[PDB]
Symmetry: D2
Subunit: 388 residues, 4 copies
Amino acid sequence: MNYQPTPEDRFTFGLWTVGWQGRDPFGDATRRALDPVESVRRLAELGAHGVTFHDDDLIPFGSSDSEREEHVKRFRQALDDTGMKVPMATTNLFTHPVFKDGGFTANDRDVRRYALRKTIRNIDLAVELGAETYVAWGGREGAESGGAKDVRDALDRMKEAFDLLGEYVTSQGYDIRFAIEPKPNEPRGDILLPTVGHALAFIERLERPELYGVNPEVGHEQMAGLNFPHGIAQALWAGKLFHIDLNGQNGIKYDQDLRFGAGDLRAAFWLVDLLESAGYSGPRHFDFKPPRTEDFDGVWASAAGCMRNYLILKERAAAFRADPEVQEALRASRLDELARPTAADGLQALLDDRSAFEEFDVDAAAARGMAFERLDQLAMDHLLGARG
Amino acid sequence: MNYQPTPEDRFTFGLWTVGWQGRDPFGDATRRALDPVESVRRLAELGAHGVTFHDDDLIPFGSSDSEREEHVKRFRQALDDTGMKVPMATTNLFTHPVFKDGGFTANDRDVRRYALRKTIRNIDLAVELGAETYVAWGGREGAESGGAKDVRDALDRMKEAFDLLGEYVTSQGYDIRFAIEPKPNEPRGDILLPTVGHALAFIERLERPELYGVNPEVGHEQMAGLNFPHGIAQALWAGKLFHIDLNGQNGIKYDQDLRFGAGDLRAAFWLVDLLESAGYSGPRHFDFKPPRTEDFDGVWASAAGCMRNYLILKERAAAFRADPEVQEALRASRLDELARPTAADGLQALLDDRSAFEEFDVDAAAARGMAFERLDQLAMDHLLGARG
Amino acid sequence: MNYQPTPEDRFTFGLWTVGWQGRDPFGDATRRALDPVESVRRLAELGAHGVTFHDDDLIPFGSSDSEREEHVKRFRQALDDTGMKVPMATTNLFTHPVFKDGGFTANDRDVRRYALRKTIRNIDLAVELGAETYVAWGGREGAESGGAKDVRDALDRMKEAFDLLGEYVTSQGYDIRFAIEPKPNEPRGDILLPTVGHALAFIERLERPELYGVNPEVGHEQMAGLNFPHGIAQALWAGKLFHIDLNGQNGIKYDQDLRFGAGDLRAAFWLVDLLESAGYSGPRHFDFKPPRTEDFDGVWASAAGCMRNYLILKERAAAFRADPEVQEALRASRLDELARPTAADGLQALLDDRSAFEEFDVDAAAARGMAFERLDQLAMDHLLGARG
Amino acid sequence: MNYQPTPEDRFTFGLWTVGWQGRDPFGDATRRALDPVESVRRLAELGAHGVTFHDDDLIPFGSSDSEREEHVKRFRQALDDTGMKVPMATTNLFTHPVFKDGGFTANDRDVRRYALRKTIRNIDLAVELGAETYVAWGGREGAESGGAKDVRDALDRMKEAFDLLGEYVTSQGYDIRFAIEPKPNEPRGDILLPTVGHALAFIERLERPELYGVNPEVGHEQMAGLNFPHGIAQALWAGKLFHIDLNGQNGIKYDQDLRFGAGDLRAAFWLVDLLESAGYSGPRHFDFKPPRTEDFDGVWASAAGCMRNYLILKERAAAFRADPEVQEALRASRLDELARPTAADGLQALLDDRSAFEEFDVDAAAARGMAFERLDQLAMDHLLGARG
Ligand SMILES: [Co+2]
Ligand SMILES: [Co+2]
Ligand SMILES: [Co+2]
Ligand SMILES: [Co+2]
Ligand SMILES: [Co+2]
Ligand SMILES: [Co+2]
Ligand SMILES: [Co+2]
Ligand SMILES: [Co+2]
C-alpha cells in the first residue's frame, strides 16, 4: 500500500524550494547552492511533473545578455532530457535592496517603473518556456509604520501596475494569466492584500479581471489564523483559483513553509478533498523549505514526503466520500438541504408563506440535532485509516 | 483643553452596547437589564447623536403584534423627546437556538426561509424609524468541523439571501443600503466572510453590488492579526465603507469589544486620521461592551470615554497633518511620489524608456534612505502631545 | 480493528463537559440540563472510569444544608450502582457575579475570604467522595486594564490563598494534592499564571511546593500558540504533572474545548506518545464541550469520540516506537546522543579538552545532516497507518 | 518640553542593534557593516550609557589569538575615549551552521561541548570588560518536528550546561550573574523555555538558582500573545529580573524588534510605570532593529527615538501616580484592599469567621462596581497628556 507519484499527478516544485540554502534571519546557509540543472533531474527522478521559478532563480541578477542565454539554454536542455514542464513563473521583486520599500507600490517612482520592466522581461521568458500562469507575490508591498504608506495611493499604483501588465500580455497576444499570491505579513510589518479575500476584491477593480486569479498558500492564510479550505472554497466559487501553493504551517507565527502535510494535518485533509471534489486541474505546486538542519539527502526526502502526503490524503478523502455510512451521515446533517435553493419559489411566494414565519414552529426546529459530531468522527476515522 | 462631544460629532451607540448585562461564557449577568428608553435618555445627555439596534433588542422575541407596537411607541417618544436618530438597524440571527447552525446559510431550508422573513420584517421597521443603513452580521454562519458545511453551497445560499433582500428593498422603493460585518471566528469555529477582504469580494458577486457595502469592526479585523487602518483604506478605495464599528481589542483572542481607544492605541490614531482625511461622513458607531466588573456608573463612564478618545485622537491627527515639519518629512519619504502615476506616459513609452531599465542605476536607488523612522517618531510625538 | 474503552483506561469526564447546556456569549442554551445521576450512568455505559465536578456542579448555589446532603446522597448511590470513581474535584470561583473581579485575588478582601471558605468546604466533600487531586482554575484572576490590578500584590494574595489551603489539608491530615490549571486569557483580558511555565514557577514560591502540581489543558496552552507536548514534557521533568485536561483547539482564538483529537491532530499524537512513554498514570481527563449544534445523541457521540481518538493515537504511537526502522532513524538523528551527558568528565576535563575547541572541526560537524525530515515522515506514515 | 537622555538614564544598546545590516529571510543587506568603534562613539554622542555584545559581534568568527586582542584593544580605547560601559555580554550560539540543531541542547554531543567552551571563553572576556550580567538566548534550542527532540532529555542537557557555567564562575570567583532570555519560536519551530514563566521555573531546578535570573524581551512575550507588564511583575515578585530588553512588537507574528515605544504603546506605558515604581535599577537595554528601509541617518534617528519614548512614558507614568484624582480612583477600585493580607488572622480564625461565609451577603458584595473604567480613562488621559 505505497503511494508512488507520477507526472500525471501534476506535482510541481519551485527552484527556490529544494534550492533553499537555509539562510534565516538568525543564521547562515547550511547547504551549498544547487545548480538548476541538478534540481530538474533530481525532481524528475522523484516523479515530479515540472518546476517553477523566479527570474532571479534561473538567471543571476545583473547577468549579461550573453550569460542570460547560456543559463536558459542549459535549463532548456534539462527539461528536454527529462520531459519536465514549466507551468508557472514569477518575478523576484523582494531580494534586491532596491525593492526595500516595495516593487509596484514603492514610494520612489523610478523604482516602480524598473519593477514593471523587470517583470515584463520575465513574462516574455515565461511564455518562451511554456508557462501558463504568472504569479505575483508582493513581499515588499507594505510598511512598518502608519505614515509610511498611503494605502489608498498604494492601491492605485498596484492597480496601475497590474493593469499595465494586462495590456502588455493582450498586446503581445500571450496566452498567459496572472495569479496574485496574498500574504498577511513578513518580511514587511503589514503586506498589502494580506488574504485571499483582499486579493479577490482587488482583482474586481482591474480593467480586465478575467485575466487575474489567485495563488493562495496554505501557510500564508494560516498566518492570519484563517481556514485555508474555506478560503479556497470562496476562490473556487468566484472561479479565481488559477494556481495554488501547498505546504505546512504550525499555527500563527513566521512563515515556516514546511513540507505539505506538516502543521495542520486535518486542514490538509479537508483541502485535498475540496480540490479533488471541485475538480481542480491546476498543478499541485509545493512552496516549501527543507529544514536547514538537513543535508542534500534530507532535502530530497522532504520533497518526496510532500507528494506522498498528498497521495495518502487523496486516498482517505476519496474513501470518506465513497463510504455509504458517510453518505447517510451527510444526509442526517442535512448537507443535501444546504444544496437546495432557499426561495426558488421567489420573493413574493416567500413573503406569502405562513409556514416560514406566521406558522413556523421554531421550538421544534431548534430541537433538531445537527449530528455534526458523528460526521466528524467518521471523517476522523477515515483519515487515520481506522474504520471500525 | 477638554473634549465635549456633540450631536454634530455623529457618535452613535448600539442598544446592546451600554445595554450589555455582562453574561459571559463563564459567568452570569452582573447588571440588570436597561430599558431602551433609559438608554436613549442617558446617551442623549452624554452628547450622543443616535442609537442603533437589533430587532430583538427593541422588541422581545415572541412579542405579539400588540406588544410590538407598544415597544416601538415608547421608543419613538424617547427619540422625539431627545432628538436622537436611528441611523442603523440590524437583525438578531444568532441568539435564538433556532439559529444554532446559522441564519442565511443554515443547513435546514425551513430555517433559512424563517431567517429571511425575520429580517425583512425588521427592514420595514428600520425604514419607519429612519435608518439609512442595514447591517448584517452572520455570527452563526460557519462551522466547527470540515464536513459540516460546504462553503461552495453555503456561499450560494448567502448570495441568494442577500440577492432577495436587494429585490425586496428595490421593490418597496426603500432608500436603505446593506452593510455586511465580517468576523473571523466566534461564536463559530470559523465564520464565513471572515475579513473585510472576503466581504468585499463576495459583494462583487451580488446581483446589485451597488446596494451592498461593509461595516468593519476594529476588534474583528484585529482578531485575525490584520491592520485595521489598512483594511479600512481598501474599503474606502472600493467605495464600500457604508458604516463602521469602533472599539478596542488586545491583540489576537476572543472578542473583547473594549471601549474605543483601548487595546491598540496607535492603530486607533491611524484609523481616526484616515477617517478624517478621507472625509468619512458616516456615523461613528461604537460596538463596545462595558466590563462586567463595572456598575451602571461605570457603564456611562465607559461610553463617555469612547467619544472622548475619538475627539482626542482626532485633534492629534489634525495637528500631525498640519505640522509643516511633518509635511516636509512626508516629502522626504517620497509620500508625494507615491501619488504620481507610475507610467502615465503609457506602456509603449515605458517599454522604450532606457532610464527605467537599460540605464537604471539600481545601486544608487537602493542606497536612498526612506526616512520612515523620523516620520514615525514625529507621528508618535504628536500622538503623545509631546512636540519638542 | 475497533477501540473499546474500558474503566482500566482511566478515562474521566467533568460533569460540566457532557453537561454543557450550550450557552455562549452570543447565544442561549440549546440543550436541557442533565441530572448528574444521568450523566454518571451514561458515561459508565460508555466505558468511562469516573467523573469530576465543581462544587456548584453537584450542589446548586445557595443550596441549604438539607438540600446539599440530598444532592450528595443521590450522586453517591449512582457511583455505587455503576462503580465510577471521583478522582478529581474543583471549585467554581468564576460563575457567580461575586467573583467578577476574581476569587483569591479579588480586590475586595471580604470576597477573597469568602472564596477560601467556599473552597475549603468543597475540599472536605472532595475527600469524602474519594478525590485524590483538587484542581484550581483561576478563571477570574486577572484584569482588563493595566491599573486595575497590581500583579505584585495579586501574586501575594494568590500565594497566601494556596499557602492557607496547604495548611488546612495538612492540618486535617488529608491525602489530597493541589493542581493549578493555567489559562492565558478569557474570560478576563489577561489571567494570572497564563501558561504551564508561569504556574510551575509560582509553585516554587509556595511554603509547601510538594503539595502543588499542574493541570495543563491542551486548548489553553494552544491559546498562546505554545507547544503542548513541550509544555507537558517540562512539567514531567519537574515532576509536577499531577493531572491533565484533554481536548481540542483550532489554533489561536477563544476556548473551543473541542473533543480530544480535534484541532491539532499531530500535537495530539505527540502528546499521547509522551504520556505513554513517560508512564503517566494519572487519569485521562476530558475537559471538552459538545457543540451546541448537537442534541443529546450528539453529546454522547462526542464523548465516545474522545476515548476512541486517544486509543487510536495510543496504538499508532506504540507502533511508531516499536518499529525498528524508526529505532534506526532515531539513532541516525542522534536521539541517543542527546541522552548522554555533555560533560560527565567534569568541568576541568572539558576545559582541558582540545577536541572540544582548539582542535574541533566545526566545518565537518556543521555538514552533518540531522535527518529529521526522514524521521518525521516515518512518524507521519505511522499516524496515518500508512506504512509503506 | 524636551526629553534629553543622559548616561545617568542607564540606556544601553547592543552592537547588533544599530549594527544590523538589514539581512532578512527574503532580502539582502541594505546597509554596510558598522565598525564597533563607530557605534560606540555615535551612541555616546546620543547620550547612551553603554553597549552590550555577542562574542561574534566584537571578534569575527575564526579570529586568531592575535586578531582577537587587536579587536578588543580598539574597542577598549573607544570605551575609554567616551566613558561608555559594558554592563552585559552574551554568546552567539545561533549564527554558525554548526549550531543548526542548537548549542547547549544540540543532539550531537561534540557540538554541545564546543558550545560550552565557546561560551566560557566569552564569559572571561565579559568579566575583563566589566560586564555584570551574562545573557543566554537559546535561539537554536528547539525543533521543527515532534520526534526530533526529547524535551525531557533536552532539559537535562540544558540544566547540565547552566550548572557547569555556574561552577566555572564560582570557581573563578567571578562577580557575574546569568540571565536567560526566553522566546516562543523563531528561528526554530518551537524554542525551549518559550516564556518568562518557563525560564523562571527551569531556573528553580538549577544547582545554584541564586546565580540565574531572566532577561525578558517586550517583543518575545508578545509573540505568544502574553501581557509583558504582567510577565515582568511575576519576575520582580520572584526577584529574578536581572536584565531586560526593550523594543516594539505588532501583535503576534515574526520578531519585529521595532524601536521601543512602537507596537503596543499602552503596554509600554504600563511597563515603564512598573519598572519605575518597582525601583528597577538594571540597565534599560534596547534590543531593536532599525528598519532596512532606512539609511545610516535613519538608524541613529531610530535609536534616539527609543530613549526619547522611554523618557516621555516615564514622565506620564509619574504624573499618573502623583495625580490625587488618580490616587482617589485607586482607592475607589480597592487597589489598597488588594494590598492587605487575606487572612492575617490565620486559618482557624478564618474558619470560625461567620462573616466570611455563614453570614456573608454575596448579593451586596457582587453589586459593588469596580470602577475600573474610570481609572483606565484617567490613565489614558495622562498618557495622551490630555488631562481635562
Ligand atoms: Co510561505
Ligand atoms: Co508561496
Ligand atoms: Co466584536
Ligand atoms: Co460589531
Ligand atoms: Co478550555
Ligand atoms: Co480545563
Ligand atoms: Co526579538
Ligand atoms: Co533580545
